[PDB]
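User: Is it possible to get a 3D structure for a protein together with its bound compound? The compound here is chloride ion. I've pasted both below.
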Amino acid sequence: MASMDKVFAGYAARQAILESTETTNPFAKGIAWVEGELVPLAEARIPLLDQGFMHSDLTYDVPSVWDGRFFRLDDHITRLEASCTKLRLRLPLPRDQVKQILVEMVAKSGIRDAFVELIVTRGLKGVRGTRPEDIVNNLYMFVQPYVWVMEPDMQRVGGSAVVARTVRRVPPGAIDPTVKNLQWGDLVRGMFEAADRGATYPFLTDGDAHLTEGSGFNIVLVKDGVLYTPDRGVLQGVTRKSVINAAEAFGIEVRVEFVPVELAYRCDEIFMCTTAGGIMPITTLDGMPVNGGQIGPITKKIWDGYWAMHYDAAYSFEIDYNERN
Amino acid sequence: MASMDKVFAGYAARQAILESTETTNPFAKGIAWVEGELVPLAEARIPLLDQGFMHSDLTYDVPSVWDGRFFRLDDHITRLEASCTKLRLRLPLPRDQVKQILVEMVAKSGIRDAFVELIVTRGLKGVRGTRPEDIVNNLYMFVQPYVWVMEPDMQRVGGSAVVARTVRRVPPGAIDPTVKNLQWGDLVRGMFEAADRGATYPFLTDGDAHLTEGSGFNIVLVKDGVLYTPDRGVLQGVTRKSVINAAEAFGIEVRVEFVPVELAYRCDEIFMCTTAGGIMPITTLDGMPVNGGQIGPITKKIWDGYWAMHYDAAYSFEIDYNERN
Ligand SMILES: Cc1ncc(COP(=O)(O)O)c(CN[C@H](CCC(=O)O)C(=O)O)c1O
Ligand SMILES: Cc1ncc(COP(=O)(O)O)c(CN[C@H](CCC(=O)O)C(=O)O)c1O
Ligand SMILES: [Ca+2]
Ligand SMILES: [Cl-]
Ligand SMILES: [Cl-]
Ligand SMILES: [Cl-]
Ligand SMILES: [Cl-]
Ligand SMILES: [Cl-]
Ligand SMILES: [Cl-]
Ligand SMILES: [Cl-]
Ligand SMILES: [Cl-]
Ligand SMILES: [Cl-]
Ligand SMILES: [Cl-]
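Assistant: Yes, that's possible. Here is the predicted structure of the complex:
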């Protein structure tokens, strides 16, 4: 219930070092792997005919680095492989080589707090009209400075959400939300709706009176000392997984189940969770304060627990930035 | 009711001529417009950070050229602008300039039968966390040899379809299907399902016992001299529009309305329609011959009518090759 000052101050200090190197290190603003070559992220290009662009025929995943430590990298690569399997894709390199490249990329960038993305696409030939044996999947990877879906200043007070009414989440029988994907048509609609309504974060329903997820995050409700989070219709987030780990360590019950929309209007606390920002409190919903409008005690406990895990060998490992090896 | 021989023979003759130019015209296999530069299609590259790739945050449209005549180009540009408006995008160049560039591209390629695609993306900055004033949309365009969703020799016989059971169409309240888009998660699932079931084409339902569309085409049923095609849940196809034009000219009623799945099992004829292939008969459905399994008389009449429209000044214009239209 009190790690924010230190977590954010550490980040600010590391950030200041990174920023100072932007004119000397061409990778300080990010680095990409394309067709076996490493290039500054702003200069990275992909073939126009890649079906990842032509029909968003891809999956992706986003591990992260915090304070020079990769967080749950194996979980993210395993989820990527699972997503590939569901799409009949195959990770184009052995996963141990992939890990080695990522660590090399991070080390070269000098970035201590990083957003790391891997993308596997169908390749230069589409599914339609192609012999399955002629299909060759493509891999793209990049590392960039850590991305905040909720900035540190706002995490201190909580953000503003709406339950979206002009859009609902793509259902699993159309697109499987457990397959991480970049088909964000509904999520972008949600972001526009939130903004139109004077808020920031959209919570999308399943179009059947139950909650799913938002534009880049899972949703957790807190009521009478219990956490509630949607089971079906959502990405099985690694942050959400970490929230469950922390809750279990603290003796807090977590129910991963169908969550009726009505619970969002009568719960004690709300937070979002995602790799790109961590634990993100929501203190206004549909223009109304959430139970008084302050960040709640269980949210604070989970917040602290989540960041503590980033230093636990069971969930993280230290990257060697030395040059080299 | 028999224009197939002449239409396909003409195409074959033009294909042979096109092929003979490939060793001397670097654009004969296709040409792309990227950031104001014209490049061979295979060499075209886009920024990795373009949000058209990063979150498929884009719309697109696909006019075509047949026998050196652009087909309904104005309709396609108008639909593109409509799609852009619905996504809060804006065509980055005046539409008259866009048409001029397209004609120039086709002429340089020397392609007489062409698939032409325009893509408008959100640009290098995403909706999330960006000042709306800081967003600059991007334009990509390319011309390639005509693409067949059903090959000419399969159109002579008819194709096999299934009503998909493992996937349904993304509903409009999640992603608006009247906005042409490349978020094909459900459509690719449909293609895999069709293949798994020994058929070529998937027909997707609305997940509520009514038909919508398939993987790159609209669906038309013929029953007792009347055409039926889904109103809601689908792209408002320009080919479908052309089918309606031809049918009205022929005195054939067309009902654009809710089409129950059951009608597909008791109708007299079925065909698919799309810019990438035209009029595409379906003669087996779920492994069962459609009303005897032969291409039907109304399908043939529409087939002929559709291709005749490609030479009709009301619907087309001739491109001036080596001099621009
Ligand atoms: C739809 C969706 N649901 C849930 C999550 C949370 O899952 P995890 O805890 O495994 O991260 C994400 C993460 N999406 C953000 C990217 C969003 C952006 O950059 O705008 C991420 O990959 O972290 C997401 O995109
Ligand atoms: C989902 C969908 N519905 C209907 C249609 C028919 O609409 P129109 O008659 O306006 O073309 C298309 C055409 N999409 C094809 C896909 C091409 C491909 O798969 O390679 C196109 O863009 O021409 C489509 O993609
Ligand atoms: Ca450390
Ligand atoms: Cl530190
Ligand atoms: Cl999974
Ligand atoms: Cl509301
Ligand atoms: Cl999805
Ligand atoms: Cl290791
Ligand atoms: Cl000819
Ligand atoms: Cl089209
Ligand atoms: Cl139109
Ligand atoms: Cl079935
Ligand atoms: Cl769609």
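The helical segments of chain B are 4-19, 51-54, 73-86, 95-109, 152-155, 185-196, 238-250, 297-309. The first helix of chain B runs from residue 4 to 19.
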